[PDB]
């Protein structure tokens, strides 16, 4: 789905499979967090479905020894003195010592400030202990979390329930057309993108000889040249757009290991899983009712949440009993208008826009004369069309698909291409759709705060700030205090400070809240990037102080007060909203749960040959399953006829379903339901 999804999958630790355990043979003890998992397996990143606990992600600094156990690094403390010597310990090796928590107050020489420090012991015991007892200590505060888990800013303020959803949904992000690095970061976004392998790093130092949208050439210092080709508009495993783009220009000195080009969900070499959106935390006319989301139409007009999606369609021409399937433009009883988008071979041409039902590949199969309906043989005689012994089996666009044909690949047995025995031609058609953000598309943040698009208002309807800039997204207030994920509120504050910039009062010394802050933070320009490392980073004392010294806009006015709220105007009436509203910038991601895929409907269609019931799944054009629990609701209502209608004429009544379709197109009344064919099979099985 995105580079983070690819990097996480390779670092997955699964308990299922041969030699491990069956899913039915796994109690509530194998799945929950173990104290030995500290710094080895993540306690947050794991699916919340039936595979919870059975699949984990390796911790950031963790590694595997040649035996099979997981090692985690530690700084060896000699005699209450922190040393830069680092050694990896196994699980049972860690228990034979005691390790201090990463955030211990340490002298510049290395001595602990307090005699008693929080220390982990064997069997998951935490207690204070003398400074002369600490053998090792943690390398980094984020030593226990995974890569995707470490990408959640202000993670220490979110409960584990929504934090799990925050990391799981980050892997579900969709690569957008253009990508923006988040204003609020954790530092992990850089190494997560480079190590994932979807960017283009420079192997050797040199200068850019020739740069194009197709390839980048680097002239090394010794004299050799290495040229990196760009992966342009390639379909991923899940239909997402894998598109790389150069970053350097002509004649740029670039060092070794530096990102010269970044791919999907990447901005200047950082994981760009979403966009920075101007968010207002307020209910708005019920359109954001429990977890619903309201969007400004600006995100549609400016392709902010627009993403490219590529589907792969395929059909082959085989050898049949009565002849050979041939791919041809000549299709029986089809006008020259439907075939107008086809070339002379019967293939759709590159660049042609195709809706659902359009012909992609025109294939005809010879059907025997002894296989004809009585009406079909009469209908063939009353139209005088002889020599049409072939029927239509052309590759058509599925329901719900639409886009531009971007690539064609043809394989033919005639042209030395090795096909499976019995095949004469193989054609793959690549269709790409440009999907803007639609009503119902599932968005989400980094704190497990998910919701579908409930309403896309015009830009004038959206609540706008004092200087007329309308907000982009309206998140409901009611769905914030329950989930215990204040990290979104804290990110919204720091997100605005990053968007505006700040200047701390330097006169009369450095204020008492910014004493811990680095000197680089005391001044910030608008649209500045910041890092809030997990379990470290910005404290609420420093965050409150930054809202007080936010930079003014171009007019010189400060739009957001010291509390973090601002006065908004109702774009529908004009009256200002009676109270200030928290307004800032939050990183929102477009998840791969789009309504363009998740909408489905069926009047009639294919039926399973054995049970004569409608097919299942959207890909097979199947209908919904009126399950066992759903039948109880009918009976509880007493809706007898609705229940009989569902299980008979609308499902597996072989003659009833056809007589119902005729009764509708005739305007007649619905006939009486017959006997289900599935019940006939039951008796023939009992025999």
């Amino acid at each position: 789905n995105n580079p983070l999804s690819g990097l996480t999958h390779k670092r997955r630790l699964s308990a299922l499979g041969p030699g491990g355990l069956s899913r039915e043979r796994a109690g509530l003890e194998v799945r929950d967090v173990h104290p030995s998992h500290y710094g080895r397996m993540c306690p947050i990143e794991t699916p919340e479905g039936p595979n919870i606990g059975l699949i984990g992600s390796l911790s950031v600094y963790a590694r595997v020894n040649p035996f099979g156990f997981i090692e985690t690094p530690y700084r060896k403390v000699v005699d209450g003195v922190v040393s830069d010597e680092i050694v990896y310990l196994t699980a049972d090796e860690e228990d034979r010592h005691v390790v201090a928590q990463a955030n211990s107050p340490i002298d510049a020489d290395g001595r602990f400030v307090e005699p008693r420090v929080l220390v982990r012991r064997k069997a998951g015991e935490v207690e204070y202990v003398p400074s002369s007892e600490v053998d090792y200590m943690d390398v980094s505060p984020r030593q226990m979390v995974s890569v995707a888990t470490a990408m959640i800013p202000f993670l220490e303020h979110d409960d584990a329930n929504r934090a799990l959803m925050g990391a799981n949904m980050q892997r579900q992000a969709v690569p957008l057309v253009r990508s923006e690095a988040p204003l609020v970061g954790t530092g992990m976004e850089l190494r997560a993108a480079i190590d994932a392998g979807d960017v283009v790093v420079a192997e050797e130092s040199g200068v850019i000889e020739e740069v194009s949208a197709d390839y980048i050439t680097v002239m090394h210092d010794n004299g050799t040249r290495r040229t990196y080709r760009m992966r342009k508009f390639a379909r991923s495993n899940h239909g997402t757009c894998a598109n790389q783009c150069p970053i350097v220009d002509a004649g740029d000195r670039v060092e070794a290991g530096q990102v010269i080009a970044d791919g999907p969900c990447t901005d200047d070499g950082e994981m760009a899983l979403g966009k920075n959106l101007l968010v207002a935390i307020m209910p708005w006319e019920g359109h954001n009712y429990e977890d619903a989301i309201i969007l400004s139409n600006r995100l549609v007009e400016e392709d902010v949440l627009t993403s490219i999606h590529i589907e792969e369609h395929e059909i082959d021409a085989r050898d049949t009993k009565l002849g050979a399937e041939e791919i041809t433009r000549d299709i029986p009883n089809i006008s020259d208008e439907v075939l107008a988008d086809l070339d002379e071979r019967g293939i759709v041409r590159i660049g042609a826009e195709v809706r659902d039902g359009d012909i992609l590949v025109g294939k005809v199969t010879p059907k025997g004369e002894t296989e004809l309906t009585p009406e079909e043989r009469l209908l063939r005689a009353i139209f005088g069309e002889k020599a049409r012994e072939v029927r239509d089996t052309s590759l058509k666009v599925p329901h719900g698909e639409s886009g531009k044909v971007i690539g064609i690949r043809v394989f033919s047995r005639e042209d030395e291409d090795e096909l499976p025995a019995g095949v004469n031609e193989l054609v793959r058609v690549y269709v790409a759709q440009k999907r803007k953000i639609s009503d119902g598309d599932k968005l989400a943040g980094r704190h497990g705060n998910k919701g579908v698009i409930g309403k896309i208002l015009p830009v004038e309807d959206m609540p706008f700030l004092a200087d007329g800039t309308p907000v982009d997204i309206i998140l409901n207030t009611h769905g914030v205090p329950r989930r215990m994920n204040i990290g979104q509120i804290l990110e919204t504050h720091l997100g605005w400070c990053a968007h505006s910039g700040w200047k701390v009062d330097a006169a009369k010394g450095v204020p008492d809240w910014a004493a811990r802050l680095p000197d680089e933070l005391l001044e910030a320009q608008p649209n500045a990037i910041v890092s809030t490392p997990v379990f470290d980073g910005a404290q609420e004392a420093e965050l409150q102080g930054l809202l007080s010294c936010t930079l003014p806009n171009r007019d010189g006015d400060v739009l957001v007060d010291a509390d973090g709220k601002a006065m908004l105007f109702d774009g529908r009436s004009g009256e200002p909203f009676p109270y200030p509203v928290t307004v800032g910038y939050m990183y929102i991601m477009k998840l791969h749960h789009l309504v363009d895929d998740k909408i489905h409907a069926r009047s009639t269609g294919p039926y399973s040959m054995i049970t004569q019931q409608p097919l299942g799944g959207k890909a097979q054009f199947g209908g919904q399953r009126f399950g066992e629990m759903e039948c109880w609701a009918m009976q509880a209502y007493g809706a007898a006829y609705t229940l009989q209608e569902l299980l008979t004429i609308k499902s597996d009544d072989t003659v009833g379903r056809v007589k119902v379709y005729e009764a509708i197109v005739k305007g007649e009344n619905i006939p009486e339901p017959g006997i289900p064919e599935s019940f006939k099979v039951l008796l023939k099985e009992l025999q």
Binding site: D268, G269, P518, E520, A524, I529, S531, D536
Partner: peptide, 23 residues
Amino acid sequence: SNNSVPGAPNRVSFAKLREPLEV
């Protein structure tokens, strides 16, 4: 500064604890 090793954009970190071992 954060991650001053490959030549990446300068992201400013609210870090009070130094990183002894890189990822």
